[PDB]
Symmetry: C2
Subunit: 206 residues, 2 copies
């Protein structure tokens, strides 16, 4: 149906393509149940409301004005859209020169960045997301948020444009890693698409 406000973008890889880090059954459920549900519920939640014709970024920027259903499902849809795009089965991607320079000046190295994101992910009590954002000053920052909240929401303490997000809801890792979220976080770097993160960085700075 071309007239629904929001649609899930198909994955640019197979469900089993990320098996170095994420099991195929999790990819399938995470995409076809969890994310699909957020998108469907988003469309329902904004229908007949002032949010109905707003872009996802604009919904999020005013999310405190809308229902919890809008907030939770707008977050969910946005976060997952971004998540799938920053994963890849193509090994050895790396940050663009511009991004790498910013990473090194801000964190020291790519390993130091990964350590900071891993720590943020591990410290998120309950469900949530770890983020690398470009803040409103153009500077990189690592944050985490609860549930499906994200750095574009007016509610959020550390605001910025996300360029990388890692889902630390238990559904994202429990089938393969159970309670070992840290092992999930260590391993997911194997499938991060730094080309997409770098594109998001370039667009954020504009």
């Amino acid at each position: 149906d071309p007239f629904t406000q929001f649609k899930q973008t198909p994955l640019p890889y197979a469900y089993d393509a990320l098996e170095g880090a994420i099991d195929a059954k999790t990819m399938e459920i995470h995409y076809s149940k969890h994310h699909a549900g957020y998108t469907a519920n988003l469309n329902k939640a904004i229908a007949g409301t002032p949010a109905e014709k707003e872009s996802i970024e604009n919904i999020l920027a005013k999310v405190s004005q809308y229902s919890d259903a809008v907030r939770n499902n707008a977050g969910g849809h946005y976060n997952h859209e971004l998540f799938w795009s920053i994963l890849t089965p193509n090994k050895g991607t790396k940050p663009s020169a511009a991004l790498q320079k910013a990473i090194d000046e801000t964190f020291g190295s790519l390993d130091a960045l990964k350590e900071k994101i891993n720590a943020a992910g591990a410290a998120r009590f309950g469900s949530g997301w770890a983020w690398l954002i470009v803040d409103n000053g153009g500077k990189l920052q690592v944050t985490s948020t609860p549930n499906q909240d994200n750095p574009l929401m007016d509610f959020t303490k550390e605001k910025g444009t996300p360029i990388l997000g890692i889902d630390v809801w238990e559904h994202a890792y429990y089938l393969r890693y159970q309670n070992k979220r840290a092992d999930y976080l260590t391993t997911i770097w194997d499938v991060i698409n730094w080309e997409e993160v770098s594109a998001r960085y370039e667009k954020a700075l504009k």
Copy 2:
């Protein structure tokens, strides 16, 4: 070590005893990793604070005076201690006469209560718990809380003494049910120990 402030109560059944609703792997991890972690981190978080020799209920009742680590781990420890106690492998328990009468007068029937708890559990976005509590009015109430918060915590709006809690963190159900939290909630009734719920009701009154 007998001197630790909080200990996990041994499980009163085997890890595979609840397979009518909860897989053995989940029980083992849930108990020996998630709950054990809360208990250990609680003991650490209270060390050298005014909470150090307080009862768990008294920590919860004043929880906002303490760190977030105390809140999260006191809630974690409390909630799981209660949770294990209200599960059983023995089919066919039922509320006491007193609890059954109260349930019927307040919700209509046991089925109506289960429906209300199932709905509360399903509606809890993210991690958390569904509860049946006794409010200070003696009245039964169904609520939910986020994360490891619970109805004994000082800041909680819907306060009361929990007599039944059902964990809806994904770790409680993902290995067996994956996204199907509603199926977990429907099925868990088969292992609820209404004799313990009823003993908790008696104590709460």
